[PDB]
Design a protein around this ligand. Structure first.
Ligand code: HEM
Ligand SMILES: [Ca+2]
Ligand SMILES: [Ca+2]
Length: 306
């Protein structure tokens, strides 16, 4: 069983070291908090939160960094290396990369203005990386609501609250133009923009992402508060201003009978959202962890101990 007090004796300063690292990084890179939260999400959805995503290529297995959902998208790896080194200095061979990334994600949310809580700890590091599983398990922005639900259920998160609350991670961070081009100019081969996208916002997005333009250009997930972790993400959905298809479907999908009331509840109360986010975050953080003597306490998050 994972427990929040796992390192209270072996490394009481772990959370503070993680926090300090993120605070320093945020000065030069204001997007790092969002990036780190996403790394934890992509770690947990592939064989569980086992730091498998942090592993680099080997001649025996490919890195998850080359998965469609990670390649030229996932970032912050050097920052994780930095805090790991700092933690290894303070507490040699004690804190796993899996736990480190989980704490990093929580501290990132808190630093961005979100809720503060102690995440369960005790996870251990994987002995391999899973590229094929990452390609299969990571959800895509073009997924329909049924597909999004399927993706979450596939890894162990059955609740619509899990999906709606965790999607709130898009209350900050960036998204490439490439992922919304269809919504803007030719949605589902209709030759028309996605009808669930507010027409005024449509114009704004088209200006940021012109047809035949730079597909790697970045746009804010939350037009209200781009870098603050708050419930504004849901207010946007209510006005048909979710950025990607997967965001707006939580409110507009024909299959959203169960998700609409959740979107409204989170848009109506910060407390309700934050409570749900922490609950869902801990559930995601409890996905098939290696514990006890299983796996290792990786010294270098990029490679398995030898
Ligand atoms: C429900 C399905 C989800 C889909 C389809 C999805 C899709 C995406 C896409 C397309 C991007 C843009 C990547 C890029 O342009 O490089 C992204 C970014 C992001 N996602 Fe998600 N996401 C989902 C769920 C989540 C969850 C559960 C979290 C965390 C709790 C999360 C947190 C983030 C953050 C913070 C960013 C910004 C990262 C950065 O700016 O570096 N996402 N997501
Ligand atoms: Ca993983
Ligand atoms: Ca926000």
């Amino acid at each position: 069983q994972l427990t929040p007090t796992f390192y209270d004796n072996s490394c009481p300063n772990v959370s503070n070291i993680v926090r300090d690292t993120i605070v320093n990084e945020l000065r030069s890179d204001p997007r790092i908090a969002a990036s780190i939260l996403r790394l934890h999400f992509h770690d947990c959805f592939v064989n569980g939160c086992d730091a498998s995503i942090l592993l680099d290529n080997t001649t025996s297995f490919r890195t998850e960094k080359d998965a469609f959902g990670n390649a030229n998208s996932a970032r912050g790896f050097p920052v994780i290396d930095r805090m790991k080194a700092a933690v290894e200095s303070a507490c040699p061979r004690t804190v796993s990369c899996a736990d480190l990334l989980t704490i990093a994600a929580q501290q990132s949310v808190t630093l961005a203005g979100g809720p503060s809580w102690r995440v369960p700890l005790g996870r251990r590091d994987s002995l391999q990386a899973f590229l094929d599983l990452a390609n299969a398990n990571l959800p895509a922005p073009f997924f329909t609501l049924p597909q999004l639900k399927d993706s979450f259920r596939n890894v162990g998160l059955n609740r619509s609250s899990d999906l709606v609350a965790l999607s709130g991670g898009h209350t900050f961070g960036k998204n490439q133009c490439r992922f919304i081009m269809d919504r803007l100019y030719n949605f589902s081969n209709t030759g028309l923009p996605d009808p669930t996208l507010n027409t005024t916002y449509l114009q704004t997005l088209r200006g940021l992402c012109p047809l035949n333009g730079n597909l790697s250009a970045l746009v804010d997930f939350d037009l209200r508060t781009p870098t603050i972790f708050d419930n504004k993400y849901y207010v946007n959905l209510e006005e048909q201003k979710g950025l990607i298809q997967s965001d707006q479907e939580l409110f507009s999908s024909p299959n959203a009978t169960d998700t609409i009331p959740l979107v409204r509840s989170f848009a109506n109360s910060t407390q309700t959202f934050f409570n749900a986010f922490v609950e869902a975050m801990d559930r995601m953080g409890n996905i098939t962890p290696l514990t006890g003597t299983q796996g290792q306490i990786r010294l270098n998050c990029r490679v398995v101990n030898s």
